Amino acid sequence: WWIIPKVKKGC
Amino acid sequence: SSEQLKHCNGILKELLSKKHAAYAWPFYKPVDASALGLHDYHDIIKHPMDLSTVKRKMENRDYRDAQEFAADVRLMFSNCYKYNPPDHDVVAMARKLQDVFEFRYAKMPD
C-alpha cells in the first residue's frame, strides 16, 4: 500500500 | 511461435508471483487515478497498461507474437517513468520489475 500515493510505499 | 508465447506466459506468471510481489503490486491492476488523487494521470498517460490487462489479453489469445506482448509490458513501465519523478518509490519498484522482465525476456527460445 502507499503511505503517500506513488511517493512512499508502506508494505 | 506458440513456443515463444509460452515463454511470454511464463514471464507473466513470474511477474505475478509472490517472489516479486514486493515491487510488482503497483502494477497488478490499472492505476486508480481517482482513488490516489492523481487527477492529471489520464492527461499525461494516454495508453494505460497493467499486468491484469496483459493477463486478460494472454488468456484471450490476443497476442500473436512475443514482440506484441513485450510492447505492452514495456508500455506499462514507460507510463510509470513518464508520470512519476524518478525519486518516488514507484519508479524504483518499476525499474526492479523491469529488470526481472528484460533479463528473462532476453532468454527467448530461438
Author numbering:
A (entry chain B): 1 to 11
B (entry chain A): 346 to 455
The paper states:
Within this class of proteins, the bromodomain and extraterminal domain (BET) family contains four members that are transcriptional coregulators and that recognize acetyllysines (AcKs) using a tandem pair of highly homologous bromodomains (BDs). Despite heavy academic and industry investment in this area, the generation of paralog-selective inhibitors has proved elusive because of the extremely high sequence similarity between the bromodomains of family members (90 to 95% within the acetyllysine-binding pocket residues). Using the highly conserved BET BDs as a model system, we conducted three mRNA display-based RaPID (random nonstandard peptides integrated discovery) screens using a single library (which contains >1012 unique members). Crystal structures of 13 distinct peptide–bromodomain complexes revealed highly diverse structures and binding modes among the cyclic peptide ligands.
Overall, the peptide backbone itself adopts the same conformation and all intermolecular contacts in the AcK-binding region are also conserved. Minor differences are a 180° flip of the Trp1 side chain and a change in the nature of the contacts made between AcK9 and the C-terminal part of helix αZ and N-terminal part of helix αD in the BD, which is distal to the main AcK pocket (a region less conserved between BD1 and BD2 domains). In the structures with BD1 domains, this AcK lies within a channel formed between conserved Phe (in the loop following αZ) and Asp (αD) residues. A tyrosine residue replaces the Phe in BD2 domains and is positioned in the opposite direction to the Asp, leading to a loss of this groove.
